[PDB]
Design a protein around this ligand. Sequence first.
Ligand SMILES: [Zn+2]
Lengths: 577, 74, 233
Amino acid sequence: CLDLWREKNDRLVRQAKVAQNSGLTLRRQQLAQDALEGLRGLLHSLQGLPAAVPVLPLELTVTCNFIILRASLAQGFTEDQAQDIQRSLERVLETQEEQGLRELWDSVLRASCLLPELLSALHRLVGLQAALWLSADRLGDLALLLETLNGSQSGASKDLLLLLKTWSPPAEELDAPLTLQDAQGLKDVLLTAFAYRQGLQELITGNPDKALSSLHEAASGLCPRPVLVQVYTALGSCHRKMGNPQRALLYLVAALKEGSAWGPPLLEASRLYQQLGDTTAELESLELLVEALNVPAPQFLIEVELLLPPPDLASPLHCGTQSQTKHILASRCLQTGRAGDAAEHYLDLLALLLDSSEPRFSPPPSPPGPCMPEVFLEAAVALIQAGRAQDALTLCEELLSRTSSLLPKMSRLWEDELPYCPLWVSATHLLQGQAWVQLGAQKVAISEFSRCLELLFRATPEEKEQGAAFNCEQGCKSDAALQQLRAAALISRGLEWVASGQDTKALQDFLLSVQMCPGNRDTYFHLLQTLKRLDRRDEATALWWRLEAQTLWSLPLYLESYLSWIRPSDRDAFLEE
Amino acid sequence: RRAWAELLAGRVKREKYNPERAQKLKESAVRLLRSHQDLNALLLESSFIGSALQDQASRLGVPVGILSAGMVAS
Amino acid sequence: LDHPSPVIPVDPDACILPDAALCAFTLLDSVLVTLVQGPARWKMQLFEQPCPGEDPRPGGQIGEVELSSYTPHFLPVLCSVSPSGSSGGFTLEDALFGLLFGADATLLQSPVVLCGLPDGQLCCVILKALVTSRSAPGDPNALVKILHHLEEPVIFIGALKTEPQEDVHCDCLVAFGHHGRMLAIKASWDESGKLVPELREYCLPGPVLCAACGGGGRVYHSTPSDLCVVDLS
Ligand SMILES: [Zn+2]
């Protein structure tokens, strides 16, 4: 019977390995699932009996080869494999010598200290279950288990790395029933994977000195080129954080050469050149990164990639899609004052997003970043700063066309805090006004500014009474954004009153903006210029004292850029006069 | 309605994947980073560095020892 | 269906994405959407589907997510909902589409995917937003959102042209429980000068077994007793 079971296990192992080595995308997974059903049925057959000692090391070889091919296909460990380990462990325990895995492992290793000839399969089981606890982030008790495997008086070694180094493979693995992977091949994997994890965690938690050692450890040894790229990229990040630019650049070049996936290196390069202030090189790096991301095997085995965690946003290895980077390029081109280039970039972005019906999808930025209207606003700001106001009106028209059904019916306009209008509707009218200003149309400009102001005061964006949809969490809610935007529209109206010769109305608007946002100082500059024109002495000084009594948090970019555009260069010079 | 499509029509470059173009792009990235490289300050900051001096030697058509010793002395 | 005894066994060459854990699926124009069981967290995926007539392939997965809200007889159900301007699903009207899914979907002209689960939750996913990779993992709390929590399992999702006064621009969104909780959503724009939803959680008799949607706000459903019908018009 055991001859048949062992030939069957060897047969399914040969089948799975043929599938790994050969085949196409279907036939591979088909053969793998067939072998998986085979190993499931064979485990059932072996577990049907009250198995003895010589049935044990075949049953365990089957269990290990079954969990391997389970997790290589599911592409992640879970708890069914852990419960299968528990089943096999109670099967080892009730033959010779219950509550949970830690004490069960301690007692099973006590039984193994009696030296039954299955330590080659126990070490393999330990490899798989150490992989499971690592991918499950169960880091503490893994040290306890490995400390129980090795000598007990080496318990003072709390660091996992030396303990994993000391954990040997038990034997040269003589002619036992065949297996998919040996415990040394699992050891190297566990080493590099844990080293990577500890290094990245130390990077993210502000230990970019400690991270270098772990990452160099992950580099030295079995390190597949795909993971070697990520290591070099993380070392570049660590050096860039410390200050050292040149070692960083060296690692990044290594990453580019070794890599078939050279996005995150160029992202980190850009984040470095931003620290140095070489803005031109930053933009050139991002220009390359887009073209790079333009271009678009699962082995039946336990590799490193299976164990490494999917990355976070704080990581240097987060690289979003071409669209989510084309937005970085355009945003960073607009923040610096290259608004013509930024306009072309933003129109390219909107072309990608809205002409996406037939081909593979290109997504918008993520909802830490801007919502989809904020993108249009940023586009229009860019087109204003370029000198393309007759395009900055067509942007805004298409935005309001597309969201007509969402806009409020402005019957509260007739009935005059309570009703709801999100910031971007008001902001649309604002930009739509400044466009007409640049085209020279006082009347319709003031019309649009007044419409923005009505929507700003006769409505609340922070109506989180009924959660009815998807909404902007942060950008189109901020009270700071509301007050800055109120002030912006008041100022942009007052300057047109100045142009028309209605300085009293202008004074009313500037005064109201000062009442609204007392910490912008553009308000005070405009107000004091007007008071210096009309009635200099007393009122000016009265507001000087207010300024020096007074003496950015998280604004949207369409507002930041609108303010930087309208503000005059001669601000502080006039404010010390 | 019309001017919108007029803005957006000539923008897209549908894919232009071209795996041969990819290596030219890669070479251009390397050229940029190496252009901002500085080997003297790099030494002021391992096998990577030996490879860097080998790259300089391959450029200049010089045996590595000369350039290594010159950079060391400087 | 050309397919070059009247019984025909299926050859495993025809299998595409043999995920061997997928519990549900649907289809849109050039795109496929699946929904696959695992341990506690179930996970939506999104695949290409080759536009040109070729060897019928899946393609490579555009995106995944994890419906973190669901922690487990009754399979889930999926329904596609497209708006006007952008397919075996439903085309809604702009008012209801914007009311339920928001401005991002309305501007991107993005189809949406409604998954009703055995818990009774009815979750929406925008597709354009669901593009992911190993360098860019999908954030569930951002990407999957939850319309309504029926207490009981889900049988049917649909949409109706109430006010009917092939491509019909629906105005109503219908769901159905096993035990007979119907749910209907409509656009109001009432009473404060603002767009509001009109919900109605009805409570029909019977364990409902099946349902459908017919011309003009009629919903043919079935019980263990009889085939009945409901009108929302
Ligand atoms: Zn927003």
